[PDB]
Amino acid sequence: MHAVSVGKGSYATEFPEIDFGGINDPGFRDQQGEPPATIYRSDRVTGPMQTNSWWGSLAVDRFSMNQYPHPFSVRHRAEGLHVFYDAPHNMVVHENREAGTWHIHGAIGTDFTIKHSGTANFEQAVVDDYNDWYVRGLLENGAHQMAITYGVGSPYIFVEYEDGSAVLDFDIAPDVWEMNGHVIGFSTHDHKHYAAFAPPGQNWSGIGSKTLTNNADYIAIAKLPEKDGNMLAKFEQYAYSVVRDAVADWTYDEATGTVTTTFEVTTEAKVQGAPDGTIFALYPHQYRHLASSSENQLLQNYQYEIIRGTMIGLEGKRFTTELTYPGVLPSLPDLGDYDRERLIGYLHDATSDYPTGSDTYELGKYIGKLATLAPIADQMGEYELAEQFRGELKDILEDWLQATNASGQLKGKNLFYYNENWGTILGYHAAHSSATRINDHHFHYGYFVKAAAEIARADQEWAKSENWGGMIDLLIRDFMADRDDDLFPYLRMFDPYSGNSWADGLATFDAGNNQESSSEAMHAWTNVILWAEATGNKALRDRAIYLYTTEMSAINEYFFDVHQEIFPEEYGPEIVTINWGGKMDHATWWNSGKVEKYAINWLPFHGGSLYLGHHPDYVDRAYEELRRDIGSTDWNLWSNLVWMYRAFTNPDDALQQMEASIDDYGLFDPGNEKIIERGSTKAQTYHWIHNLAELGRVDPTVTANHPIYAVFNKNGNRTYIVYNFSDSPITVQFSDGHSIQVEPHSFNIGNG
Ligand SMILES: OC[C@H]1O[C@@H](O[C@@H]2[C@@H](O)[C@H](O)O[C@H](CO)[C@H]2O)[C@H](O)[C@@H](O)[C@@H]1O
Ligand SMILES: OC[C@H]1O[C@@H](O[C@@H]2[C@@H](O)[C@H](O)O[C@H](CO)[C@H]2O)[C@H](O)[C@@H](O)[C@@H]1O
């Protein structure tokens, strides 16, 4: 066979002969392919190749595209490594009124080029090593080699030379304001402040000219926060400690809900006595959550301005952040003041819904929709309908989770395949370049895990490894593997340091990598929490908890700017739709209207969505701005998503809008998402808004000693919600002294 058996399921090991289903569209057909054959990595990098990284273009392009190892941007070329910093004069905020788009971006310039004395014509740049957030790029020309070590959160670039020495080349002569022989402080013609470091005795030459040279086979470059010799002296201390290892280790304390992450480097000395450590540049989502024991390592005045706001300097081997996991739910409970017969009707209406495509994404949206309806059907006493939805889920997954047909041949569609070259599970039919660019695996597979988590909630037997569980856990491994996974790189999607996932597998853009729907990422993480809890997989659960909680911290900074500190004042919208390494867009990957540029970071609504309601002033600010722009509450598209979002702070208003318009159209209509977004239903919309109306506001100030919970607060009156996935009753302690007993396989309140 060209298939590997996993419990009752299987994946392909040879590329299937695709069933194109008579579709001739060149786009659709090109989608049904594989990621690039050529990987630019040396023979030192073996095993499943890392993807979905800030540095991906180094691996995919012969050289690289523009990359953002903050505070720097860099790019590999035949001539060497171009180095740049966006100063305020490089930054712009542009609006296209007719498109309804905004762009915050810098420039693709060159402050200087780091060069090798022996060649300006390297053949390629390869990935020679990487760790949790640094990369080692190797520019290669036979005996001539230049190895560049750099990373997000590193104000150093470390440069190692073979068969040559260091050259720094400038278009306009820099100002060398400090000359210590082997160490120089310099500024570009336009006043960007840098430093360069060589070992003692290896003195810089060409001071005053456009080309600075050093005979050493090792230099470091630093971005300096200020033209300041005291800072230069501090940067000297770690300029010879090249980062070799970097690890973000975490723990989840289930009793308190605290997610603790330690970021640790291990360096190699390039001069005698070089300390084992570095100067880290911390992002807002890190330093705003800095542990007490790390506070003394801060270099208070060491600030860098970047697209994500202000970075700050911290010195040493490690630092720690502390975050609070807020819980998730399998769905909202039965606590609304809805008309029950009206909800039952909408539940039956949803039997008309069908997927709007055969690809993993459209099919994903559909199964997430069914998985969302089934607990509501249970709650309304419609157990036979709930079972129909779960049966349809089972039928869909039992199809997709087998790579072979009844005769034992590979299927042409509705299957998964292991690309060995990169080491990734791909689904066919594919879309959004999920296969050709290894894009969005969390977005797509998150919907599959949702379907499986809802099945598992009602049927533990189905979810066992030897049954359909093994294939689900394989999908999960693809997008969030642990270390030393034989088939997959570590935490594919996630960048533990930038604190968010990256959607593009290749990152071949001059803006670095990107993420549009942070909510579909949070959806993926929620679903792994639910799945792992249902199936008794503690290690997997805690990993998804760490991801959910960390991703949340990046979202509130860089998507939402809840603290009003990151977006430039002149930027009109109250959200960034797509975050890049180097820029921020109020824009979508498809041609869209006004609502979608907000709501793509809200959808889908589910039992893990309550994170969206932690900052009520933000929810109001964002809503009101979209309302201002629309000019009324007549939403251009996806009205139901707006109402559901509005319910976080004002469910009376959400109810009123809903009552006025929910029944404007009848049954599922793919051509019309004015009222109901195609991944959503009337039943979901109606259930959510009424639940929020009775419960009040999300209360993130209360934690619990178990992971599957929520706490709401209505005018000082708290409602506590727990779902118990266990065969035994549990007792849950909340952080405000409240405690509750929960029966097996049930909610504490609102089971229906
Ligand atoms: O990059 C991640 C996102 O990619 C999007 O597809 C892009 C195409 O629309 C565009 O024409 O080409 C680029 C490659 O140059 C594609 O990456 C997907 O639609 C998104 O779903 C995805 O997150
Ligand atoms: O409403 C029809 C339009 O929908 C678009 O799909 C969006 C996806 O591209 C994006 O990845 O996710 C959102 C939310 O699920 C979808 O609305 C299509 O791209 C458009 O071609 C289509 O006109």
Q: Is 504 annotated as a binding residue?
A: yes
The Cα–Cα gap between 744 and 742 comes to: 7
Residue that is written with structure tokens 């390592």 in the block? 297
Best CA proximity match to 301, nearest among 315, 312, 289, 288: 312
- Rounded to the nearest angstrom, the distance between the alpha carbon of 432 and the centre of ligand 2 is 10
Please give the sequence-ordered ranges of beta strands (E in DSSP) within 13-87, or none if there are none: 73-77, 80-84
The Cα–Cα gap between 149 and 152 comes to: 11
The count of other CB atoms within 10 Å of the CB of residue 121 is 11
| Exposure string for 96-119, b = 16+ CB within 10 A, e = fewer | eeeebbbbbbbebbbbbbbbbbbb
CATH class (in words) of the domain with range 340-698:
mainly alpha
Q: Which strands make up the sheet holding 9-12, listed edge to edge?
A: 3-6, 9-12, 415-419, 424-428
Under a CB-based contact definition with an 8 Å cutoff, are residues 532 and 540 in contact? yes
The Cα–Cα gap between 30 and 454 comes to: 33
- Rounded to the nearest angstrom, the distance between the alpha carbon of 591 and the centre of ligand 2 is 9
The Cα–Cα gap between 89 and 68 comes to: 18
The Cα–Cα gap between 127 and 139 comes to: 9
- Name the residue with the closest Cα to ligand 2, atom 7: 590
The count of other CB atoms within 10 Å of the CB of residue 302 is 22
- Name the residue with the closest Cα to ligand 2, atom 13: 600
Best CA proximity match to 60, nearest among 96, 89, 36: 36
Residues whose CB falls within 8 Å of the CB of residue 350, separated by 6 or more in sequence, listed in order: 369, 373, 668, 681, 682, 683
Residues whose CB falls within 8 Å of the CB of residue 273, separated by 6 or more in sequence, listed in order: none
**Binding site membership of 504 for ligand 1 (Cβ less than 6 Å):** yes
Residue type, 46: T
In the DSSP assignment, the letter for residue 737 is S
Token readout for 484 is 């030393």
Q: Which strands make up the sheet holding 101-105, listed edge to edge?
A: 92-96, 101-105, 583-586, 578-580, 514-515
Helices and strands counted in the chain (H then E): 16, 34
Under a CB-based contact definition with an 8 Å cutoff, are residues 369 and 677 in contact? no
CATH class (in words) of the domain with range 57-243:
mainly beta
Q: Is 514 annotated as a binding residue?
A: yes
The reply to whether omega before 429 is within 30° of 0 (cis) is: yes
Token readout for 721 is 């919600």
Which ligand is nearest to the Cα of residue 515, counting in written order? 1
- Name the residue with the closest Cα to ligand 1, atom 5: 432
- Name the residue with the closest Cα to ligand 2, atom 15: 679
**Binding site membership of 439 for ligand 1 (Cβ less than 6 Å):** yes
For residue 94, the cross-strand partners are 103
Domain spans in the chain, listed from the N-terminal domain onward? 57-243, 340-698, 699-752
- Rounded to the nearest angstrom, the distance between the alpha carbon of 590 and the centre of ligand 2 is 7
**Binding site membership of 590 for ligand 2 (Cβ less than 6 Å):** yes
Residues whose CB falls within 8 Å of the CB of residue 393, separated by 6 or more in sequence, listed in order: 367, 370, 371, 374, 451, 454, 455
The approach used to solve this structure was X-ray
- Rounded to the nearest angstrom, the distance between the alpha carbon of 602 and the centre of ligand 1 is 19
The Cα–Cα gap between 66 and 398 comes to: 43
Under a CB-based contact definition with an 8 Å cutoff, are residues 512 and 506 in contact? no
Under a CB-based contact definition with an 8 Å cutoff, are residues 242 and 160 in contact? yes
Probe target for ligand 1 pocket from 502, 504, 508, 592, with the most ligand atoms within 8 Å of CB: 504
The Cα–Cα gap between 441 and 453 comes to: 17
Under a CB-based contact definition with an 8 Å cutoff, are residues 343 and 687 in contact? yes
Under a CB-based contact definition with an 8 Å cutoff, are residues 54 and 513 in contact? yes
The atom of ligand 1 lying closest to the CA of 437 is: 17
Q: Is 673 annotated as a binding residue?
A: yes
**Binding site membership of 673 for ligand 2 (Cβ less than 6 Å):** yes
Catalytic residues: 440, 516, 520
Token readout for 522 is 């949070």
- Rounded to the nearest angstrom, the distance between the alpha carbon of 676 and the centre of ligand 2 is 13
Residue type, 685: T
Alpha helices in 591-718 (DSSP H): 596-599, 616-630, 639-646, 651-661, 682-695
Which ligand is nearest to the Cα of residue 52, counting in written order? 1
Best CA proximity match to 543, nearest among 249, 205, 173: 249
Segment holding 554, helix H or strand E: helix 538-554
Positive or negative, the CA dihedral 463, 464, 470, 473 is positive
Compute the chain's Rg from CA coordinates: 27
Distances (CA, A) of 525 to 160, 327, 725: 39, 12, 17
- Name the residue with the closest Cα to ligand 1, atom 18: 432
For the chain, report the end-to-end CA distance as a whole number of angstroms. 48
**Binding site membership of 589 for ligand 1 (Cβ less than 6 Å):** yes
Residue type, 292: S
The Cα–Cα gap between 692 and 481 comes to: 35
Helices 441-458 and 360-379: angle between axes, nearest 10 degrees: 30
The Cα–Cα gap between 713 and 696 comes to: 5
Q: What is the DSSP string of 364-410?
A: HHHHHHHHHHHHHHHHTT-HHHHHHHHHHHHHHHHHHT--B-TTSPB
The Cα–Cα gap between 145 and 114 comes to: 13
Segment holding 471, helix H or strand E: helix 470-480
Q: What is the DSSP string of 507-551?
A: --STT--EES-HHHHHHHHHHHHHHHHHTT-HHHHHHHHHHHHHH
For residue 196, the cross-strand partners are 184, 221
Q: What is the DSSP string of 314-373?
A: EEESEEEEEEE-----SS--S-----HHHHHHHHHHGGG---S-SSHHHHHHHHHHHHHH
Q: Which strands make up the sheet holding 258-269, listed edge to edge?
A: 241-252, 258-269, 318-324
- Rounded to the nearest angstrom, the distance between the alpha carbon of 507 and the centre of ligand 1 is 10
The Cα–Cα gap between 551 and 522 comes to: 7
Q: What's phi and psi for 565, nearest 5 deg?
A: -130, -15
The Cα–Cα gap between 457 and 454 comes to: 5
